[PDB]
Structure formats: structure tokens, C-alpha cells
Design a binder for this molecule. Sequence first.
Ligand SMILES: CCCCCC[C@H](CC(=O)O)C(=O)c1ccc(C#Cc2ccc(Cl)cc2)cc1
Ligand SMILES: [Ca+2]
Ligand SMILES: [Ca+2]
Ligand SMILES: [Ca+2]
Ligand SMILES: [Zn+2]
Ligand SMILES: [Zn+2]
Length: 158
Amino acid sequence: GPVWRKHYITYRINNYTPDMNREDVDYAIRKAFQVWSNVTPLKFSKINTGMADILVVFARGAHGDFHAFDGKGGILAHAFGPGSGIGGDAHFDEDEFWTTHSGGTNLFLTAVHEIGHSLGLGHSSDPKAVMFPTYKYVDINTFRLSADDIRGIQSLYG
Ligand SMILES: CCCCCC[C@H](CC(=O)O)C(=O)c1ccc(C#Cc2ccc(Cl)cc2)cc1
Ligand SMILES: [Ca+2]
Ligand SMILES: [Ca+2]
Ligand SMILES: [Ca+2]
Ligand SMILES: [Zn+2]
Ligand SMILES: [Zn+2]
């Protein structure tokens, strides 16, 4: 049907992963959402029934990701552009070992990046902006966002 929205976005979480703790995914995804929403004119909303805009699914390198990247570290996940259905969703290398709160890779870091890809604009290309390709494990404790960066996205279409 006729799709043309620019404020209210939908979201859906996969089966809470097989390993990754569900409560952990909700907390990490919740915090990232507030950071992306509180810095954006477009509010977001998760559900668990009807179709949604940003869909988060856990899979191992196979369906793409450049002939299946890794499954034990390296990258964490990726997301596509707009569109419908599949478009706007992301895939996290579930095969690997994810660590909630601490122990390695946090869901928050991937949640913020994955989310920004769906809504957030282009990247910065610079070892500092929460979007750049270069991966660097960093507990959310230091996950800080430049005022100019967040202010630019909110000031653009907001
Ligand atoms: C050109 C292909 C890019 C692949 C790079 C790996 C992939 C990119 C993506 O998420 O889309 C990935 O899984 C990934 C890459 C970077 C990060 C990060 C980060 C980060 C580091 C430090 C700070 Cl302060 C903030 C964020 C996460 C996942
Ligand atoms: Ca990985
Ligand atoms: Ca989608
Ligand atoms: Ca896993
Ligand atoms: Zn993928
Ligand atoms: Zn990116």
C-alpha cells in the first residue's frame, strides 16, 4: 500500500537470540533508541505482532555480508537501507560469542550502529563517529556522541 512516513517508525526484535539474554537485548536496544530518538525529530516504537520499519534479526555470515564475514569476533552486524519488509532490517553474527554488560562485544554498541544505519544518515568516516566501519570494542561506559554530530542530524530534518 501507500507508504510515506517521516516521524513515527516501527521496530521488531528477533527471537531474543538463542544465547544473548532477552532482557539484555531489550535494555541495550532501549538505551540506543533513546539516544537516536532524543537526537532525532522522528520517534521510534518497538512492537511484537505487526510489520515494523527497523527489524533486528540474528544470523551467521551466509545470506550475504560478503560471503559470510566472521562468526567469532570481527564485525558485529549490518543493516540495509529503506524500502519495505526486509529493507531496513539488520543481521548480527549470532554464531560469534556476544557479551552483555561486559566480556567482549556489547549489544548496545551494535544496537546504536545498526539503528543509525536504518534511520541515521550517512557516516563520518573518522575514528570517533558512532557509525564508521572500523570496529573497536568499547563498553557503553565510554559510548559518547559528539554534540555536533547529534545536533546536525536533529537540526537537519528536525
Ligand atoms: C564497508 C563494510 C563495513 C563493515 C564493518 C563491520 C560492521 C559494519 C556495520 O556495523 O555495518 C560491524 O559489524 C560494526 C562496525 C563497527 C562498529 C563500531 C563501533 C564503535 C567503536 C567505538 C565507539 Cl566510541 C563507538 C562505536 C560496530 C559494528
Ligand atoms: Ca562478529
Ligand atoms: Ca524492515
Ligand atoms: Ca551467539
Ligand atoms: Zn547479513
Ligand atoms: Zn556503519
